[PDB]
């Protein structure tokens, strides 16, 4: 709906801002959050910090409603931050002006936020980020030993960009070849294991976390892996998918294609109307006609999304993506190797025109393109992705 705007900064809350706008732009997630009332309570009484987790969720409600508003660039993150310190001692850390909080790892903030929603909603939030893997564990020296896990799963996928990488795409491959060792020689030596995951069940919403923070031993400093990556606007994951799962996904994708065309047909017919003047209605600015048309458009777009979801087979399970394609909606980029006082920037795909993106440099709004984000060289030459947020097509 209404255009996203400045997110109030006040110093040392850059990281914090970026992650919050990021979550908001997911359509489903926004609504569940808006529809959260303390009357429904926590859906898990498995946590001694059950009450605090409700409170976070409510402050994010506040932020989201105001973010959407074109009027309010205030969202008041002063209280939200306070709450975070109590919930988790990670966020009480690091000396700074006023309270004690400073710049942090957006990776740390994201994992912690994740549990907060998970406890309040329960399993509903969770299924929308669960990744199953059929993982084969074969010792490089003892290939003969093969131990198979089928129930291995994780909420989050790691893209390792250490080792030869030049692209995000390459890095997604390397990320499956985690390497672990095992003191047992009943599994065949203390050699590195090739660990090879295929994804056998996609979630509705996919979280990519760049792993790259490490202490560069040789220079005795914090560093981050400097190797080039480039993130294409459209992602396709068809190769990582196990053949059998992949076929179903290609069929589903076709119904989705039809809606995307009717959505872009009636979109063009909007642009024409605005282009022409208002003609006779007499002692009126054109502006009053124009605002009305802007309002139609935002409505029509939410309506089109609902058509994709209804058309999906009732065979499809909640917590599965309909397709093998995803669309980039939010990039949390990081700058500076230190995150002790590095700077976070946010790129958020525009609602009203998916084509357009708003770069939110904290409070300050500037217009950039989808292309500008593609053209990034990544590394340290320019801003480079640390967390990527990917949305199933048509959701």
């Amino acid at each position: 709906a209404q255009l996203p705007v400045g997110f109030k900064n006040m110093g040392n809350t850059c990281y914090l801002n970026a992650t919050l706008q990021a979550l908001y732009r997911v359509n489903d997630l926004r609504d569940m959050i808006l529809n959260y009332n303390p009357s429904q309570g926590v859906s898990n009484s498995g946590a001694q910090d059950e009450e605090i987790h409700k409170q976070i969720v409510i402050e994010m409600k506040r932020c989201f409603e105001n973010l959407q508003n074109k009027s309010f660039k205030s969202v008041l993150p002063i209280v939200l931050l306070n709450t975070l310190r109590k919930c988790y001692p990670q966020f009480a850390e690091r000396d700074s002006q006023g309270g004690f909080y400073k710049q942090q790892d957006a990776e740390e903030l994201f994992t912690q936020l994740f549990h907060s929603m998970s406890i309040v909603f329960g399993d509903k939030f969770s299924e929308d980020f669960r990744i199953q893997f059929k993982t084969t564990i074969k010792d490089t020296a003892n290939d003969n030993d093969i131990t198979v896990k089928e129930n291995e799963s994780d909420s989050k996928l790691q893209c390792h960009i250490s080792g030869t990488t030049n692209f995000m795409r390459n890095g997604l491959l390397e990320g499956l070849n985690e390497k672990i060792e095992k003191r047992s020689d009943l599994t065949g030596a203390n050699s590195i294991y090739s660990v090879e995951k295929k994804i056998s069940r996609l979630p509705k919403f996919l979280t990519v976390q760049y792993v790259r923070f490490f202490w560069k031993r040789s220079t005795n400093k914090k560093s981050k892996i400097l190797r080039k990556v480039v993130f294409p606007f459209q992602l396709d994951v068809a190769d990582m998918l196990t053949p059998e799962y992949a076929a179903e996904k290609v069929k589903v994708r076709d119904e989705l294609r039809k809606v995307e065309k009717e959505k872009n047909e009636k979109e063009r017919e909007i642009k024409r109307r605005k282009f022409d003047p208002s003609s006779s209605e007499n002692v009126m600015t054109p502006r009053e006609q124009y605002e009305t048309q802007v309002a139609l458009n935002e409505s029509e777009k939410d309506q089109w999304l609902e058509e994709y979801k209804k058309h999906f087979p009732p065979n499809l399970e909640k917590g599965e993506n309909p397709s093998c394609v995803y669309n980039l909606i939010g990039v949390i980029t990081h700058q500076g190797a230190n995150s002790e006082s590095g700077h976070y920037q946010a790129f958020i795909r525009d609602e009203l025109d998916e084509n357009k993106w708003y770069k939110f440099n904290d409070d300050k709004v500037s217009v950039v393109e989808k292309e500008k984000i593609e053209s990034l060289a990544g590394g340290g030459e320019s801003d480079s992705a640390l967390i990527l947020m990917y949305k199933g097509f048509g959701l």
Binding site: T165, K216, K224, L226, G379, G380, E381
Partner: protein
């Protein structure tokens, strides 16, 4: 020379430009190869349009 803050081996290639410091002579950023494409990209004109 050597790596500055931390410059991956895999970034530096024959023909790749480098940014090095005045006199402490260490790589900060790998820089895209060659400055000569930029010069010649001025001449380049995109898909001209004329009706057949």
């Amino acid at each position: 020379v050597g790596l500055g803050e931390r410059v991956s081996p895999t970034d530096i290639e024959e023909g790749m430009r480098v940014g090095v410091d005045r006199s402490k002579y260490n790589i900060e950023l790998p820089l895209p190869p060659r400055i000569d494409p930029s010069v010649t990209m001025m001449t380049v004109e995109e898909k001209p349009d004329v009706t057949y």
